[PDB]
Amino acid sequence: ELRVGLEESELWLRFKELTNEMIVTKNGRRMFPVLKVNVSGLDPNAMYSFLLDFVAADNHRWKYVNGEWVPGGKPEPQAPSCVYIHPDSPNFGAHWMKAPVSFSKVKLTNKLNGGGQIMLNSLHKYEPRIHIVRVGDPQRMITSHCFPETQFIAVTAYQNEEITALKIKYN
Protein backbone atom coordinates (compact mmCIF):
# COMPACT_ATOMS: atom_id res chain seq x y z
CA GLU A 1 0.00 0.00 0.00
CA LEU A 2 1.24 3.59 -0.73
CA ARG A 3 2.11 5.19 2.64
CA VAL A 4 3.48 8.76 3.01
CA GLY A 5 4.62 9.47 6.61
CA LEU A 6 5.59 12.83 8.13
CA GLU A 7 9.22 12.90 9.40
CA GLU A 8 10.08 14.78 12.65
CA SER A 9 6.33 14.78 13.55
CA GLU A 10 7.22 15.31 17.29
CA LEU A 11 9.14 18.55 16.21
CA TRP A 12 6.22 19.84 14.09
CA LEU A 13 3.84 19.16 17.04
CA ARG A 14 5.93 21.40 19.44
CA PHE A 15 5.44 24.26 16.87
CA LYS A 16 1.75 23.37 16.31
CA GLU A 17 0.94 23.52 20.07
CA LEU A 18 2.10 27.21 20.13
CA THR A 19 0.40 27.84 16.73
CA ASN A 20 3.08 27.62 14.03
CA GLU A 21 4.15 30.74 12.06
CA MET A 22 6.22 30.93 8.84
CA ILE A 23 7.78 34.23 7.68
CA VAL A 24 6.87 35.44 4.13
CA THR A 25 9.13 38.05 2.45
CA LYS A 26 9.39 39.90 -0.89
CA ASN A 27 12.31 37.62 -1.92
CA GLY A 28 11.02 34.42 -0.22
CA ARG A 29 11.99 32.59 3.00
CA ARG A 30 12.75 28.86 3.49
CA MET A 31 10.60 26.99 6.04
CA PHE A 32 11.60 25.76 9.50
CA PRO A 33 10.85 23.05 10.23
CA VAL A 34 11.42 21.67 6.69
CA LEU A 35 8.65 19.37 5.40
CA LYS A 36 10.17 15.86 5.04
CA VAL A 37 8.26 12.61 4.37
CA ASN A 38 9.02 8.90 4.13
CA VAL A 39 7.39 6.95 1.28
CA SER A 40 6.63 3.26 0.85
CA GLY A 41 4.46 1.35 -1.64
CA LEU A 42 5.41 3.18 -4.85
CA ASP A 43 6.38 1.04 -7.86
CA PRO A 44 10.22 1.11 -7.49
CA ASN A 45 10.45 0.75 -11.32
CA ALA A 46 7.97 3.60 -12.17
CA MET A 47 8.87 7.30 -12.48
CA TYR A 48 7.06 9.96 -10.37
CA SER A 49 7.25 13.72 -9.70
CA PHE A 50 6.65 15.13 -6.17
CA LEU A 51 4.73 18.46 -5.97
CA LEU A 52 3.99 20.65 -2.93
CA ASP A 53 1.20 23.20 -2.52
CA PHE A 54 -0.46 25.01 0.42
CA VAL A 55 -4.24 24.82 1.06
CA ALA A 56 -6.01 27.76 2.79
CA ALA A 57 -7.44 26.37 6.10
CA ASP A 58 -10.14 29.04 6.85
CA ASN A 59 -12.81 31.44 5.44
CA HIS A 60 -11.23 34.19 7.66
CA ARG A 61 -7.86 35.63 8.69
CA TRP A 62 -6.16 35.50 12.08
CA LYS A 63 -4.80 38.11 14.55
CA TYR A 64 -2.50 37.71 17.61
CA VAL A 65 -4.27 39.56 20.46
CA ASN A 66 -3.21 39.38 24.16
CA GLY A 67 -0.92 36.35 23.40
CA GLU A 68 -3.80 34.38 21.72
CA TRP A 69 -4.50 33.81 17.99
CA VAL A 70 -8.13 34.81 17.26
CA PRO A 71 -10.30 35.30 14.15
CA GLY A 72 -9.01 38.60 12.68
CA GLY A 73 -11.37 39.57 9.87
CA LYS A 74 -12.59 38.52 6.45
CA PRO A 75 -10.03 36.73 4.27
CA GLU A 76 -8.12 38.28 1.35
CA PRO A 77 -8.88 36.75 -2.07
CA GLN A 78 -7.15 33.31 -2.40
CA ALA A 79 -3.38 33.36 -3.20
CA PRO A 80 -2.81 32.29 -6.87
CA SER A 81 -2.34 28.50 -7.49
CA CYS A 82 1.41 28.03 -6.75
CA VAL A 83 2.87 24.48 -7.03
CA TYR A 84 6.50 23.67 -6.09
CA ILE A 85 8.11 20.78 -8.04
CA HIS A 86 10.56 18.81 -5.87
CA PRO A 87 13.93 19.30 -7.66
CA ASP A 88 14.63 15.48 -7.80
CA SER A 89 11.54 15.17 -10.15
CA PRO A 90 11.02 13.12 -12.24
CA ASN A 91 12.62 10.07 -10.53
CA PHE A 92 12.20 6.33 -9.88
CA GLY A 93 9.97 5.02 -7.06
CA ALA A 94 13.21 3.48 -5.68
CA HIS A 95 14.75 7.01 -5.43
CA TRP A 96 11.78 8.49 -3.50
CA MET A 97 11.59 5.45 -1.11
CA LYS A 98 15.34 4.98 -0.27
CA ALA A 99 15.56 8.09 1.96
CA PRO A 100 13.15 10.75 3.24
CA VAL A 101 11.96 13.34 0.62
CA SER A 102 12.89 16.86 1.91
CA PHE A 103 11.34 20.14 0.59
CA SER A 104 14.28 22.14 2.01
CA LYS A 105 14.53 24.74 -0.85
CA VAL A 106 10.85 25.89 -1.20
CA LYS A 107 10.51 29.67 -0.39
CA LEU A 108 7.36 31.36 0.94
CA THR A 109 6.70 34.92 -0.35
CA ASN A 110 4.14 37.75 -0.14
CA LYS A 111 5.11 39.06 -3.68
CA LEU A 112 4.88 37.37 -7.16
CA ASN A 113 8.64 38.15 -7.76
CA GLY A 114 9.35 34.84 -9.66
CA GLY A 115 11.95 32.18 -8.68
CA GLY A 116 9.59 29.18 -8.08
CA GLN A 117 8.39 30.81 -4.81
CA ILE A 118 4.99 30.12 -3.15
CA MET A 119 2.79 33.25 -2.69
CA LEU A 120 0.86 33.22 0.65
CA ASN A 121 -1.41 35.84 2.31
CA SER A 122 -0.07 37.26 5.63
CA LEU A 123 -2.25 36.32 8.67
CA HIS A 124 -3.90 33.40 6.79
CA LYS A 125 -3.48 29.75 7.91
CA TYR A 126 -2.22 27.13 5.38
CA GLU A 127 -1.79 23.34 5.35
CA PRO A 128 0.99 21.78 3.23
CA ARG A 129 -0.15 19.13 0.71
CA ILE A 130 2.12 16.78 -1.31
CA HIS A 131 1.09 15.32 -4.72
CA ILE A 132 2.75 12.28 -6.34
CA VAL A 133 2.36 12.41 -10.15
CA ARG A 134 3.11 9.21 -12.17
CA VAL A 135 5.11 10.03 -15.34
CA GLY A 136 4.06 8.81 -18.81
CA ASP A 137 0.59 7.82 -17.48
CA PRO A 138 -2.30 8.25 -20.01
CA GLN A 139 -4.67 8.54 -16.94
CA ARG A 140 -2.43 11.21 -15.31
CA MET A 141 -2.89 9.49 -11.96
CA ILE A 142 -2.15 11.78 -8.96
CA THR A 143 -2.11 10.95 -5.21
CA SER A 144 -2.54 13.80 -2.64
CA HIS A 145 -1.70 13.66 1.13
CA CYS A 146 -2.35 16.55 3.60
CA PHE A 147 -0.17 17.08 6.73
CA PRO A 148 -2.34 18.67 9.47
CA GLU A 149 0.64 18.55 11.94
CA THR A 150 2.36 21.12 9.62
CA GLN A 151 -0.39 23.85 9.58
CA PHE A 152 0.98 27.37 10.09
CA ILE A 153 -0.02 31.05 9.85
CA ALA A 154 1.95 33.06 7.25
CA VAL A 155 3.37 36.24 8.89
CA THR A 156 5.67 39.17 7.84
CA ALA A 157 7.17 38.98 11.39
CA TYR A 158 6.76 36.49 14.26
CA GLN A 159 3.84 37.42 16.58
CA ASN A 160 4.44 34.80 19.35
CA GLU A 161 7.83 35.32 21.12
CA GLU A 162 7.65 31.56 22.05
CA ILE A 163 7.76 30.79 18.24
CA THR A 164 10.73 33.15 17.79
CA ALA A 165 12.54 31.25 20.65
CA LEU A 166 11.57 27.73 19.33
CA LYS A 167 12.81 28.56 15.77
CA ILE A 168 16.18 29.53 17.38
CA LYS A 169 16.26 26.53 19.80
CA TYR A 170 15.68 23.80 17.13
CA ASN A 171 17.29 25.58 14.07
Smallest gap from Cβ 78 to ligand O0P, in A, equals 25
Establish if 2 lies at the interface with ligand O0P (CB under 6 A). yes
Q: What is the C-alpha R_g of the chain? A: 17
Continuous H helices in the chain: 9-16, 93-98, 161-170
Q: Are 58 and 78 in contact (CB under 8 A)?
A: no
Crossing angle for the helix pair 9-16 and 161-170, to the nearest 10 degrees: 160
Q: Are 18 and 164 in contact (CB under 8 A)?
A: no
Establish if 170 lies at the interface with ligand O0P (CB under 6 A). yes
Whether the bond between 33 and the residue before it is cis, its omega within 30 degrees of 0, is yes
Q: How many residues bind ligand O0P (CB under 6 A)?
A: 9
Report the C-alpha gap between 24 and 30 in whole angstroms: 9
Find the binding residues for ligand O0P in span 16-75 (CB under 6 A).
41
Among 11, 34, 51, 133, binds ligand O0P (CB under 6 A): 11
Instruction: Specify the residue, 117 or 160, whose C-beta has the smaller distance to ligand O0P.
Output: 160
Among 27, 104, 143, 156, binds ligand O0P (CB under 6 A): 143
Establish if 10 lies at the interface with ligand O0P (CB under 6 A). yes
Binding site for ligand O0P (CB under 6 A): 1-2, 8, 10-11, 14, 41, 143, 170
